[PDB]
Design a protein around this ligand. Structure first.
Ligand SMILES: [Zn+2]
Ligand SMILES: [Zn+2]
Lengths: 1461, 107, 57, 83
RNA sequence: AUGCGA
């Protein structure tokens, strides 16, 4: 790029469409006929693949333009294919149309009038008149030609009327109508159309029997024979191989006779070009020749290998020449040669040659369509991971970029980057020279490329470049006096020379660290060249936004070359604009490790400083010469202690820095925060957790991660809120210097003394650890369910424990219970020891300090060093056990010791026994596995929906529209609030303690002249009236929309969410007594301030909220009874699967519903399988029929009556009706595989024999139900079956009670809400009958599809937002509801559950966005077949064409006002 | 409104569209057992007039096909009787804004 | 497959394992582990087993 | 497409993105010898110059706010509340 | 493509 070379012919859209052989021949620079590639062992063969007409080569000029290899753009040749062949990309299409035709008439086998009806629907759908397209079906009246013509007349009349109306109404235009829904209705229509087209298994217009068409797969079609009934039926109505040529000759005529419908069938929009639809589009009569420029050989270091295109194309030319040789045989034979069957072999040449050439064209297109590492064709070249689109279009290498290992440095600003002088001398900006920069650039040139702010090159306005790489100080001196020369050519008089100056201390640079996981990981930093560096230098405050660490991390440094990219990298992407994440709005940028412990130490009431020390620390952290102040002098406080000696506190130092960094025109920040250090640690009466800031003065407490690093209201967050990001950044740099210097004066250390306990602490630790010896077996006998103190060597205990070992679930219970108990021993140990039993406490103990302040470490780590490691776990449970029953060789089988399960009593300070080192090694490895796999499950989660929402942005009307224009939400989260603003928007009391400061920021008198302060406030009064009048959800007085619906919230102060308005008023009422303690502020001036804060906190027009959403759901999902975590998020977002893995339906139970009634209902709904009641099945097979006496010995009548609430009569009905019928059917299926006794009981047995062909006897325990015996007799011819196995299978397939789709209803403990029952299945219709126990209005479910089918689109939407909210809530992640709510609205944009994969992408309107995700060639094919036009709205698509992205700064245009006189 | 007891035959379903003189709506007597508009997750759906629709389409300068969609066989569309083209205003309570007004076009 | 099993005690090292894709795939033998490189005396073992009470197959 | 001046309905405030583009394009103009309408006051960075020009609203640029319909609103710098 | 650094 050069700003000196504008263009004004930008591409506005991209049309797709098939070529034509006449077009190729006319444009073609040459016909290539010679399969030769090179000649004279070293020359480009004439009229071959390397003819100079195809571009420049080997110093041979392009024979078509005469341009060198460095100048010729190249020109495309063409091949005259012998035959016609088949276009692979449309082979699936043309095959369908072959199957759709009639071979005796050459019409479509669908009724002609029905076809015309289809043309009508597709015409109305070019203009997108959907309502009229469906209204067409109603036009209705042996069918006369006058009547079928009357249907064509009436339908054409409806098209003409609906069009005339829509063009009159401007509801469409001559250019068509195109939207996501129109595209979807078209794909649906064309699909049903293709189904009707395929449905006719004989023609209709002509009644003829077309042959069945078969295909080889990619090179041959055959024409099946017909039946003499159908052939003679054709006469009364009076497999074969075919060439591509015959298909072409048929399809030309068929495609011409059906042109009238196909005109709209082959266009999704009006074919303004009146283009005939020709069959020659699916076949290749000719083949092009790419430019030689793109056919250069593969030279790898030294080896020169021919290009694979040359190879496949040469194979087409050779095979084609062989077929040309057969045509030589036609010139050869075909005089007559009446009986020379000699051509029977040449006929093998025709079939083999023809299929061969066709296959070879396929192979050149797609390797997977030919017949060991076959050179790739263009289909392989474009797709998969690469997809030329993905590896060189959606992402590229870039110039003016460097990569280097990052090194820390606290002395630079928190917004700067230390550039090593290798980069400072090797990175340039193209600076146009003016009258104002002539001095600086003349000096930079004088320095030359081999200095500091010199300059490597000079680009004239004439376009030529002059490199300074090797010019002498004399020559550069000479050029310095020519940087300002006059004009010379009217062609160049408007330009000025350019100087490629080295990167310097006034340029902004875009730093990126791989993880890109979020936009906050790639910020703009102000360049600071550091001498004698070799590594990119970065401030610590940024490392929690990049997730970077000096361990060896490498960073990419991008240097933008344009004032637009400079201004954006200094104003939009800059670090200060990234102090909060959009995920949650918690600060991601704060001090770290040592700075935290230094702040904890400096801010202790115990830290005093002499005037000398105090002032030294102050100038150490504040340089007025560096612009570090708003005073241009220094100011200081009175000492804390006037007495014996003048003494300042550390809190007085924080007061001095805050007093010196804030603007003198503003009162000091007032904040009540808290620490991460309980007051108890500073003494029995000390009070040090309340952080108190009064008018800029820290009056109580210390500071830690919670304060200036926690990014949660703490001090730094409060300064960010009150004075803005520039002040908060200044505060961060000042703190970083203050704490680094104080760590120079006093330092910080940690050692073995910081790790020891007392003799007392070891006494308690060992004494508590003596109690786990009972715990191990005590839990083993609890899970085993055996009496207390049961001997550790009881044989029954060992057998029961082997039963447990062989069962994975029982073993899970044993692990979980032993775990809970030994974890209770851990909790005891730590709670006893730790803070009380350490050999040195608090401050005196750095190890405790780092965890408790949260500089580094946790109380878990501190307890792992000082107390015990505790229970190791794997995949959620205790140590694996060998099949011998041993968890380690040294452990006897089934050892009930806690340690043998993996409980490590040893600690890092005194070591771990080797048996324990093998378990901590187990947990540590499986940790490294989880750590190494989580990143592969989060990339696809990011990209899969990042592709979709990238088009999704804020319209200028505050509505969320996609880059298409399709509206997604009418407001962002329904409030239009920016997450990066909201954090204090609901912290009224804080704003009040800082009222005058915020009044000084958002002073309204400047703005009260540009907007309205009443209209919205008045609507707020009437609506607040109606809202207090209706303060039941769906029998309220709907009449007043919210104020956000009726007035642009950015224009009439007061248009605010009713939730925020309500909270604000409720605050003003609940603090009227605080409003009776103020100097004089009032709820009308304060309420006015909070409304103005709300207007000034709104999301900007053009915000990239789609991408921000996608990153705010992806990025935090890397830290990650029902499916949880990434598989659950994939199950929703990625697949929108209508088959959840664990579908559940929650049932609220009425307040009146007893717990016992609830357990009865839980039994009453759960399914009961017949297997579940069977105790024993005895089959006595006797075989002179084959006798099977099947004896089912059940449980006791009361046993199954108390587990499943079923009777013996229900067992009678199920056995006598279901079980037997299914088993008897299974026995018949097995044959196919082969090839007392009372009168009422006697009548039952005889009747069941009468219902079932195989059964003979039936004896039932009518006295309880304990068994069901029936005799089955089969003929010898029955051979052999495994009757026991058949019975088992039918047992698990017979149900006493099943509600369709519902498995089990469980009674979980109520928590944080109404009593409910959670079912493991989803069936709303069935719970509708249970209304007398379940408030149906309060049923909820995890199954999105089932909700959509039953409760509709809004219920599925709310279910999505709830389910995702639950997934993140499980990991205690904060995620703004605005993100999830946007994502849900995007998944429901069509009224359904439209997942984010390729299937859902199909319905989007941007064809390039489809191309650039997956199945690139499939989306390409569907696009070309549509004759689609790209309106170039997709950001990806727009990137493909090198166009200013439409998001953000490209959401609008800039023009200039110029004087006319 | 035609409430069948178990089923209506597809031949009668060809009668359902057969009198452009008056819409015919078929309803399952088992599916009427509960008013889905009773449910806690289903916000208030309000049918918009032809003039309130024309006004909405004017304030936002957009086509009908560019609004968010509601399916013609959506249960709630079947409750309100939404014809094709009909816009419904959905007043939903949001976890952050309180009352929030959204819209959907029935297509 | 990557799960560290207790069978490996004394044979594969519980800590000599790479970090990344190979984790759990690239084990390391213990410093005291040996590999048989021959086979021996299988011919005399039947005689002693038969003497010890093994019934001939 | 012309939204009448009497009818402009958009945010009276300059978005951060609007401010960014204005300052970048105008700075680039000053760096290509667009006539500076304010005292250079010593400065050599064209971007800081464009920032000064914004501070005095002397910038002669107009923002064309697009609406997804295609209608747009021509707004002067001299009216859009800079911050 | 293998191993590997972050
Ligand atoms: Zn050329
Ligand atoms: Zn026909």
């Amino acid at each position: 790029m050069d700003i000196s070379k504008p263009v004004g012919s930008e591409i506005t859209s991209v049309d797709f469409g098939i070529l034509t052989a006449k077009e190729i021949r006319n444009l073609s620079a040459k016909q290539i006929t010679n399969p030769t590639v090179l000649d004279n062992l070293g020359h480009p063969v004439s009229g071959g693949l390397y003819d100079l007409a195809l571009g420049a080569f080997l110093r041979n000029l392009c024979s078509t333009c005469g341009l060198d290899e460095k100048f010729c753009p190249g020109h495309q040749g063409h091949i005259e294919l012998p035959v016609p062949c088949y276009n692979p990309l449309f082979f699936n299409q043309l095959y369908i149309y072959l199957r759709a035709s009639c071979l005796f008439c050459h019409h479509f086998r669908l009724k002609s009038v029905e076809v015309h009806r289809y043309a009508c629907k597709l015409r109305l759908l070019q203009y997108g008149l959907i309502d009229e397209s469906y209204k067409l079906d109603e036009i209705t009246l042996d069918i006369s030609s006058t009547l079928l013509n009357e249907l064509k007349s009436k339908r054409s009349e409806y098209v003409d009327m609906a069009i005339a109306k829509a063009l009159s109404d401007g509801r469409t235009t001559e250019r068509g109508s195109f939207t996501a829904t129109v595209n979807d209705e078209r794909k649906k229509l064309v699909h049903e159309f293709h189904k009707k087209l395929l449905s006719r298994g004989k023609c209709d217009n002509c009644g003829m029997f077309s042959p069945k068409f078969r295909k080889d797969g990619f090179t041959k079609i055959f024409e099946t024979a017909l039946n003499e009934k159908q052939i003679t039926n054709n006469r009364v109505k009076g497999s074969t191989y075919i060439l591509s040529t015959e298909v072409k000759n048929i399809l030309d005529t068929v495609f011409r006779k059906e042109q009238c419908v196909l005109q709209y069938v082959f266009h999704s929009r009006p074919n303004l070009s009146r283009k005939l639809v020709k069959a020659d589009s699916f076949f290749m009569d000719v083949l092009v020749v790419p430019p030689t420029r793109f056919r250069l050989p593969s030279k790898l270091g030294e080896e020169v290998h021919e290009n694979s295109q040359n190879q496949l194309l040469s194979k087409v030319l050779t095979t084609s020449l062989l077929i040309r040789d057969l045509n030589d045989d036609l010139s050869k034979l075909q005089k007559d040669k009446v009986s020379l069957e000699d051509r029977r072999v040449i006929f093998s040449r025709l079939m083999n040659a023809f299929v061969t050439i066709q296959n070879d064209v396929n192979a050149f297109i797609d390797s997977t369509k030919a017949q060991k590492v076959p050179i790739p064709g263009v289909k392989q070249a474009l797709e998969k991971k690469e997809g030329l689109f993905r590896k060189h279009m959606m992402g590229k290498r870039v110039n003016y970029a460097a990569r280097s290992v990052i090194s820390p440095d606290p002395n630079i600003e928190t917004n700067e980057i230390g550039v090593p002088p290798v980069f400072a001398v090797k990175l340039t900006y193209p600076e146009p020279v003016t009258a104002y920069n002539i001095a600086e650039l003349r000096q930079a040139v004088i320095n030359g490329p081999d200095k500091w702010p010199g300059a490597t090159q000079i680009q004239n306005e004439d376009g030529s470049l002059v490199s300074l790489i090797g010019m002498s100080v004399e020559q550069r001196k000479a050029l310095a006096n020519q940087l300002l020369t006059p004009s010379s050519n009217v062609s160049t008089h408007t330009l000025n020379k350019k100087v490629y100056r080295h990167i310097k201390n006034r340029d902004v640079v875009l730093m990126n660290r791989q993880p890109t996981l979020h936009k906050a990981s790639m910020m703009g930093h102000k360049v600071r060249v550091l001498p004698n560096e070799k590594t990119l230098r970065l401030h610590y405050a940024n490392t929690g936004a990049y997730n970077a660490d000096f361990d060896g991390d490498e960073m990419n440094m991008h240097f933008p070359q344009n004032e637009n990219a400079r201004a954006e990298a200094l104003n939009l992407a800059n670090t200060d604009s990234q102090y909060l994440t959009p995920t949650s709005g918690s600060p991601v940028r704060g001090l770290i490790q040592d700075h935290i412990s230094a702040g904890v130490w400096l801010t202790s009431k115990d830290s005093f400083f002499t005037r000398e020390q105090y002032q030294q620390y102050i100038y150490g952290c504040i340089r007025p010469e560096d612009g570090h102040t708003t005073r241009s002098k220094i100011v200081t406080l009175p000492p804390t202690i006037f007495k014996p000696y003048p003494l300042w506190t550390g809190k007085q130092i924080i007061t001095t820095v805050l007093l010196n960094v804030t603007p003198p025109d503003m009162p000091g920040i007032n904040l009540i925060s808290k620490n991460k250090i309980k007051n108890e640690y500073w003494g029995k009466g000390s009070l040090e957790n309340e952080v108190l800031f009064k008018d800029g003065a820290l009056l109580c407490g210390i500071l830690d991660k919670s304060q200036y690093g926690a990014s949660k209201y703490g001090i730094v967050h409060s300064l960010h809120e009150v004075y803005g990001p520039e002040v908060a950044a200044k505060v961060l740099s000042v703190l970083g210097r203050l704490f680094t210097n104080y760590i120079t004066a006093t330092a910080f250390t940690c050692g073995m003394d910081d790790l020891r306990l007392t003799a007392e602490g070891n006494k308690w630790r060992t004494d508590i650890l003596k109690t786990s010896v009972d715990t191990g077996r005590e839990a083993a006998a609890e899970v085993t369910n055996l009496d207390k103190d049961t001997p550790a060597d009881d044989p029954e205990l060992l057998k029961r424990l082997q039963e447990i070992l062989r069962d994975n679930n029982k073993s899970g219970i044993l692990d979980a219970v032993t775990s809970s108990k030994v974890n209770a021993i851990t909790s005891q140990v730590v709670s006893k020891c730790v803070p009380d039993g350490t050999m040195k406490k608090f401050p005196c103990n750095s190890m405790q300090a780092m965890a408790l302040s949260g500089a580094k470490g946790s109380n878990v780590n501190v307890s792992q060093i000082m107390c015990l490691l505790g229970q190791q776990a794997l995949e959620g449970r205790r140590v694996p056990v060998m099949v011998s029953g041993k968890t380690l060789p040294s452990f006897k089988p089934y050892e009930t010791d806690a340690m043998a399960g993996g409980y490590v009593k040893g600690r890092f300070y005194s070591g771990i026994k080797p048996q324990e080192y093998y378990f901590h090694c187990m947990a540590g490895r499986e940790g490294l596995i989880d750590t190494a796999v989580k990143t592969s499950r989060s990339g696809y989660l990011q990209r899969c929906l990042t592709k979709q929402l990238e088009g999704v942005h804020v319209s200028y009307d505050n509505s969320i529209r996609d880059a298409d224009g399709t509206l997604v939400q009418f407001m962002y989260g329904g409030d239009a609030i920016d997450i990066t603003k909201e954090s204090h928007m609901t912290q009224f009391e804080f704003c009040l303690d800082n009222y005058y400061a915020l009044l000084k920021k958002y002073n309204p008198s400047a703005l009260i002249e540009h907007l309205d302060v009443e209209s919205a406030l008045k609507y707020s009064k009437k609506t607040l009236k109606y809202r207090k009048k209706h303060s039941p959800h769906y029998k309220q007085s709907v009449k007043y929309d919210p104020v956000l619906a009726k007035y642009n919230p950015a224009k009439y102060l007061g248009s605010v969410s009713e939730n925020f308005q309500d909270k604000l008023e409720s605050f003003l009422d609940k603090n009227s007594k605080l409003f009776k303690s103020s100097d004089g502020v009032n709820e009308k001036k304060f309420r006015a301030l909070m409304q103005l804060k709300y207007m000034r906190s709104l999301i900007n027009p053009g915000e990239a909220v789609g991408i921000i959403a996608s990153q705010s759901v992806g990025e935090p999902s890397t830290q990650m009874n029902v499916t949880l975590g990434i598989p659950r998020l994939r199950e929703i977002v990625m697949t929108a699967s209508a088959a959840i893995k664990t579908p559940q339906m929650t049932l609220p139970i009425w307040n009146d519903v007893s717990d016992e009634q609830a357990d009865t209902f839980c039994k009453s709904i759960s399914k009961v399988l017949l297997s579940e009641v069977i105790d024993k099945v005895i089959v006595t097979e006797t075989t002179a029929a084959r006798s099977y006496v099947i004896h089912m010995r059940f449980f006791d009548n009361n046993e199954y009556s108390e587990e499943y609430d079923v009777s013996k009569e229900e067992l009678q009905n199920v056995i006598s009706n279901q079980f037997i019928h299914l088993l008897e059917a299974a026995i018949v299926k097995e044959i196919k595989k082969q090839k007392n006794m009372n009168k009422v009981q006697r009548d039952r047995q005889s009747a069941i024999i009468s219902h079932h062909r195989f059964i003979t006897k039936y004896n039932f325990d009518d006295e309880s139900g304990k068994w069901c015996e029936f005799k089955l007799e089969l003929a010898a011819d029955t051979e052999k079956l495994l009757m026991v196995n058949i019975v088992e299978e039918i047992c698990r397939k017979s149900i006493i009670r099943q509600i369709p789709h519902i498995d089990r209803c469980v009674h979980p403990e109520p928590e944080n809400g109404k009593r409910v029952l959670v079912t493991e299945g989803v069936n709303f219709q069935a719970m509708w009958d249970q209304e007398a126990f379940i408030d149906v209005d309060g049923i909820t479910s995890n199954d999105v599809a089932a909700v959509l089918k039953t409760y509709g689109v809004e219920a599925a939407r709310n279910t999505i937002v709830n389910e995702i909210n639950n997934v993140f809530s499980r990991y205690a992640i904060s995620v703004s509801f605005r993100h999830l709510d946007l994502i849900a609205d995007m998944m429901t944009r069509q009224g359904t559950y439209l997942a984010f994969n390729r299937q859902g992408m199909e319905t989007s309107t941007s064809s390039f966005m489809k191309m650039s995700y997956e199945t690139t060639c499939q989306f390409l094919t569907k696009a070309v077949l549509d004759n689609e036009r790209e309106q170039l709205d997709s950001p990806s698509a727009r990137i493909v064409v090198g166009k200013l992205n439409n998001v953000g700064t490209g959401s609008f245009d800039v023009l200039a006002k110029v004087p006319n006189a | 409104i035609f409430v069948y007891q178990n089923n209506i035959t597809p031949s009668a379903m060809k009668l359902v569209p057969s009198i452009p003189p008056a819409t015919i709506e078929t309803f399952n007597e088992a599916a009427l057992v509960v008013n889905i508009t009773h449910h806690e997750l289903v916000p208030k759906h309000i049918r918009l007039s032809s003039d309130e629709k024309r006004e909405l389409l004017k304030r936002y300068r957009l086509k009908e096909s560019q609004l968010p969609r509601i399916q013609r066989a959506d249960p709630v569309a079947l409750y309100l009787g939404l014809k094709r083209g009909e816009v419904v205003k959905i007043i939903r309570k949001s976890e952050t804004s309180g009352r929030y007004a959204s819209y959907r076009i029935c297509m | 497959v990557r799960k560290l099993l207790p069978e490996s005690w004394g044979f594969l090292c519980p800590v000599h394992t790479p970090d990344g894709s190979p984790c759990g795939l690239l084990n390391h033998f213990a410093h005291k582990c040996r590999i048989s490189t021959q086979q021996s005396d299988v011919s005399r073992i039947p005689s002693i087993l038969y003497s010890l009470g093994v019934a001939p197959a | 497409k012309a939204i009448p001046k009497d009818q402009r309905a958009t945010t009276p405030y300059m978005t951060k993105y609007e401010r960014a583009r204005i300052l970048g394009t105008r700075a680039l103009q000053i760096s290509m010898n667009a006539p500076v309408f304010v005292d250079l006051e010593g400065e050599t960075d064209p971007l800081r110059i464009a920032m000064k020009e914004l501070a005095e609203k002397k910038i002669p640029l107009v923002i064309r706010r697009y609406l997804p319909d295609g209608s747009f609103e021509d707004w002067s710098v001299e009216e859009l509340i800079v911050d």
